[PDB]
Amino acid sequence: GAMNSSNYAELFNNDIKLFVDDTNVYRVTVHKTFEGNVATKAINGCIFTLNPKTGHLFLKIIHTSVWAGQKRLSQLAKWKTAEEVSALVRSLPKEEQPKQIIVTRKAMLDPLEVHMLDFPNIAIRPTELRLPFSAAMSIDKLSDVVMKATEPQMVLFNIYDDWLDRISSYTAFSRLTLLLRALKTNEESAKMILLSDPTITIKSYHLWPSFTDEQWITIESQMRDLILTEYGRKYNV
Amino acid sequence: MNTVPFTSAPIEVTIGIDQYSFNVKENQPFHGIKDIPIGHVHVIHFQHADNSSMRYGYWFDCRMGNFYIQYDPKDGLYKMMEERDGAKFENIVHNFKERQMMVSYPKIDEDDTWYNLTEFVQMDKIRKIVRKDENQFSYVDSSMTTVQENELSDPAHSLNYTVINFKSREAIRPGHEMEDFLDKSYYLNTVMLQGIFKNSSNYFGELQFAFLNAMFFGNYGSSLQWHAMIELICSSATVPKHMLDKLDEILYYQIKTLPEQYSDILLNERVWNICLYSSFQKNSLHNTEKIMENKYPELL
Numbered sequence: 244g245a246m247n248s249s250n251y252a253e254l255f256n257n258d259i260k261l262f263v264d265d266t267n268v269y270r271v272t273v274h275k276t277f278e279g280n281v282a283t284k285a286i287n288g289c290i291f292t293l294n295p296k297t298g299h300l301f302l303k304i305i306h307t308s309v310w311a312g313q314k315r316l317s318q319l320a321k322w323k324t325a326e327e328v329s330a331l332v333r334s335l336p337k338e339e340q341p342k343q344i345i346v347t348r349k350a351m352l353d354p355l356e357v358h359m360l361d362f363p364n365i366a367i368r369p370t371e372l373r374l375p376f377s378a379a380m381s382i383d384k385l386s387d388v389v390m391k392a393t394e395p396q397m398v399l400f401n402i403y404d405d406w407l408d409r410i411s412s413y414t415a416f417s418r419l420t421l422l423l424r425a426l427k428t429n430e431e432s433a434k435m436i437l438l439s440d441p442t443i444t445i446k447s448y449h450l451w452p453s454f455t456d457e458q459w460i461t462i463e464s465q466m467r468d469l470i471l472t473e474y475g476r477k478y479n480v
Numbered sequence: 481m482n483t484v485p486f487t488s489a490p491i492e493v494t495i496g497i498d499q500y501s502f503n504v505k506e507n508q509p510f511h512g513i514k515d516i517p518i519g520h521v522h523v524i525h526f527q528h529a530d531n532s533s534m535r536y537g538y539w540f541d542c543r544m545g546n547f548y549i550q551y552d553p554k555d556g557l558y559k560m561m562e563e564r565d566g567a568k569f570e571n572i573v574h575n576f577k578e579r580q581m582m583v584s585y586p587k588i589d590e591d592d593t594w595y596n597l598t599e600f601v602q603m604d605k606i607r608k609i610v611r612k613d614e615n616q617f618s619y620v621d622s623s624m625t626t627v628q629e630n631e632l633s634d635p636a637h638s639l640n641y642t643v644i645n646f647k648s649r650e651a652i653r654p655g656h657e658m659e660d661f662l663d664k665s666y667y668l669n670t671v672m673l674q675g676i677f678k679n680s681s682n683y684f685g686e687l688q689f690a691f692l693n694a695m696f697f698g699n700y701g702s703s704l705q706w707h708a709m710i711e712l713i714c715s716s717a718t719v720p721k722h723m724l725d726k727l728d729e730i731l732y733y734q735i736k737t738l739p740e741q742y743s744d745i746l747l748n749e750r751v752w753n754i755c756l757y758s759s760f761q762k763n764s765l766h767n768t769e770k771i772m773e774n775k776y777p778e779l780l
């Protein structure tokens with residue numbers, strides 16, 4: 244059934260699985276028209292499909308042309324997500340196929356179940372975890388490839404860079420979710436922490452800076468502090 | 481007018497005939513039910529006083545044979561049997577009618593209730609849902625499971641209703657996933673009506689039979705089927721107008737006849753609220769909506 248804190252090591256076992264987050268599929272700015280009415284303008288979005296064991300991110304870019312002349316776009320976006328995830332699964336070879344797909348938002352269950360009817364042995368699961376994957380568009384290189392897209396496109400990334408050469412998947416996922424949670428709660432401060440130091444750079448083929456093991460400890464501590472500092476403001480505690 | 485003779489009533493039992501019912505005391509001199517209207521199916525059903533578990537009964541049509549009830553003390557139930565000797569049967573009822581040992585089917589002339597509940601129900605279709613080809617009548621009880629229930633254990637004792645499943649390849653055309661899931665018209669009209677049932681009369685017949693088994697025997701799988709057949713129509717944007725009008729009439733009489741005190745278990749809140757207030761046909765069931773609102777406003 245649902246994935247939560249009780250069955251959490253399951254994410255790093257050897258059964259292939261893929262988180263799917265649809266938060267950033269349908270993205271709009273809201274604005275005023277000449278007549279003083281309100282309208283939306285869409286911008287490019289993306290499906291965030293992530294194998295948590297390897298760091299594999301299938302980033303399907305959703306170009307604004309998808310939405311042209313369509314109604315009920317927030318509803319359509321869930322079905323479009325499910326269509327594209329199904330197409331991704333069909334495209335991969337049998338041994339690269341997920342055995343489970345975990346959707347971050349429960350409203351994705353029915354659309355994905357219906358699109359995956361041809362795959363009865365792939366379990367479609369919700370999760371009780373609050374995961375920060377909406378903050379994917381705070382990662383500069385991901386935001387840039389989405390906004391510059393002129394047509395539908397799939398782009399592949401390893402969201403863990405080379406971390407798995409030195410740490411386990413469990414630890415890599417913990418670092419990823421901490422970074423994204425920090426970027427989600429205070430993007431400006433989080434990015435300042437990551438780029439404060441001129442001597443630390445991001446490899447051309449990476450998303451995050453090249454920190455030593457000891458520097459990652461400092462960085463991780465600074466991200467935890469940021470999250471608590473922000474929280475004592477929200478709730479005044 | 482036809483008659484169903486009882487050999488006796490050796491155990492205390494509540495006997496129903498269609499929407500009527502009588503209490504019969506242990507060894508009370510009860511020899512059957514007369515004046516049964518010809519032209520409709522009927523159901524004769526039982527609930528023993530000493531074990532109210534297992535309601536059971538028999539669907540039959542007096543035009544298809546002469547049928548009588550006799551208690552079997554080995555299997556512990558009232559059994560329907562067919563008598564092939566016309567004249568023997570004819571004279572038995574005659575003795576029993578003459579000694580006034582039969583209750584009369586208590587049909588008010590003004591009353592169309594039973595016709596309205598069985599308008600589309602035909603014995604020949606019952607016998608394909610309930611498969612026991614050596615009898616002309618069909619046994620049903622509280623515990624029998626449906627084929628769909630079995631898929632999710634004794635097949636010869638199953639209710640073979642038509643399987644309806646909104647998240648199945650049968651319901652969803654490749655390439656029309658969102659369309660077919662949000663508007664079930666192709667599943668209703670092409671798959672079910674044109675393909676499986678052949679016409680709306682057979683569809684309504686199975687819907688009515690499912691309701692009656694749910695009501696009379698508390699058969700939970702029949703209740704599932706009744707709601708599924710309602711939801712499939714209401715969740716379709718394109719339904720022939722004559723079907724919507726007929727459906728409103730069908731459901732009105734079903735809701736009218738339901739015992740008030742059974743609403744909790746027999747009625748599925750989700751299906752009814754969706755059908756009357758959310759679905760494509762939320763404005764096409766005026767009579768059903770009115771009786772539902774005046775009789776079961778809580779459910780909604």
Ligand SMILES: CCCS(=O)(=O)Nc1cc(N)c(F)cc1F
Pocket residue numbers: 299300301399400401
């Ligand atoms: C093929 C490597 C491209 S990558 O972006 O570095 N990582 C990667 C990404 C995905 N999605 C994958 F299935 C396999 C991969 F190795």
Ligand SMILES: CCCS(=O)(=O)Nc1cc(N)c(F)cc1F
Pocket residue numbers: 485486487488548549563568569572
């Ligand atoms: C020998 C008949 C016993 S009885 O009391 O008449 N029961 C009964 C028996 C048969 N065979 C029937 F056709 C109809 C009946 F009602």
